[PDB]
Amino acid sequence: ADLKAFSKHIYNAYLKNFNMTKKKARSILTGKASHTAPFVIHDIETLWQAEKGLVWKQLVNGLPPYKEISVHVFYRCQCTTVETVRELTEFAKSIPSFSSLFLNDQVTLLKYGVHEAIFAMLASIVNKDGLLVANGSGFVTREFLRSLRKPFSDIIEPKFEFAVKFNALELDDSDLALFIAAIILCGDRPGLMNVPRVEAIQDTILRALEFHLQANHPDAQYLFPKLLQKMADLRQLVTEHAQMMQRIKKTETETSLHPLLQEIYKDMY
Numbered sequence: 433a434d435l436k437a438f439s440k441h442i443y444n445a446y447l448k449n450f451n452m453t454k455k456k457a458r459s460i461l462t463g464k465a466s467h468t469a470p471f472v473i474h475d476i477e478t479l480w481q482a483e484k485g486l487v488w489k490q491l492v493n494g495l496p497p498y499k500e501i502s503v504h505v506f507y508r509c510q511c512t513t514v515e516t517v518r519e520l521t522e523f524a525k526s527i528p529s530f531s532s533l534f535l536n537d538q539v540t541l542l543k544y545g546v547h548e549a550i551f552a553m554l555a556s557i558v559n560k561d562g563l564l565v566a567n568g569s570g571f572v573t574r575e576f577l578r579s580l581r582k583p584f585s586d587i588i589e590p591k592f593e594f595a596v597k598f599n600a601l602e603l604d605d606s607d608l609a610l611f612i613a614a615i616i617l618c619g620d621r622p623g624l625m626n627v628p629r630v631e632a633i634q635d636t637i638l639r640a641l642e643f644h645l646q647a648n649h650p651d652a653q654y655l656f657p658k659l660l661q662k663m664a665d666l667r668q669l670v671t672e673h674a675q676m677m678q679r680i681k682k683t684e685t686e687t688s689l690h691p692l693l694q695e696i697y698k699d700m701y
């Protein structure tokens with residue numbers, strides 16, 4: 433009922449939009465669902481294998497042209513992000529009263545929120561040693577990712593470090609549903625036209641989040657305040673990311689940038 437039912441509705445919408453969940457992820461990582469472990473991408477050879485059947489099963493990968501391993505992997509990174517971006521924008525449709533905002537504000541919230549939510553959800557498919565890809569059929573090593581040349585390794589690490597530490601909060605999927613909603617309904621995004629409307633919606637989300645957290649984690653006293661502090665850390669993450677992506681565009685001109693991502697980075701901060 434009410435906050436309880438609100439929390440549940442957002443959760444259901446989450447389940448409907450993201451097919452890889454933390455639950456699934458952990459089930460694979462610990463070896464529970466598995467029998468056969470994920471194929472591991474940890475170098476150039478294995479990355480090649482993974483794309484020809486074991487992880488990605490397409491004859492022609494559909495990626496832009498690349499002349500080196502670092503750029504190739506970065507194209508994979510962009511593909512994942514775009515995937516999650518699409519799911520986020522569809523998930524936002526189930527956020528009560530979101531779709532009724534000015535179109536320009538819907539755009540603004542998502543332009544400035546998807547990366548924060550993606551970075552929060554990243555912890556879900558991560559451990560300290562690497563991360564799941566392609567609905568858990570693949571597993572890419574942290575090590576492999578750190579071996580890419582700058583600026584590509586540099587762009588990846590901070591997110592990796594935030595993801596691993598974020599896991600210390602022990603959130604589950606029904607917690608994450610509300611958290612990502614609260615992320616998207618942020619009132620301080622540059623260029624919002626009707627801040628009070630956006631903030632009233634976020635308020636309803638924040639109320640249910642505090643509600644759900646205490647219901648779902650009775651023993652974790654300061655979970656709510658801790659989660660809210662993560663919002664600031666996510667902001668700093670994306671703020672740095674925008675500078676990194678601007679530098680990619682200026683000093684890695686041979687690196688193709690997905691047009692949806694370009695649209696996001698455009699005039700971003």
Ligand SMILES: CC#CC[C@@H](C)[C@H](O)/C=C/[C@@H]1[C@H]2C/C(=C/CCCC(=O)O)C[C@H]2C[C@H]1O
Nearest residue numbers: 473505508509510512513550565572588591
């Ligand atoms: C091979 C391989 C691999 C591992 C990846 C495919 C893994 O599947 C991707 C994980 C990426 C991380 C690395 C990032 C790079 C930023 C560039 C794009 C953006 O603007 O997001 C951002 C993180 C978000 C997540 O989608």
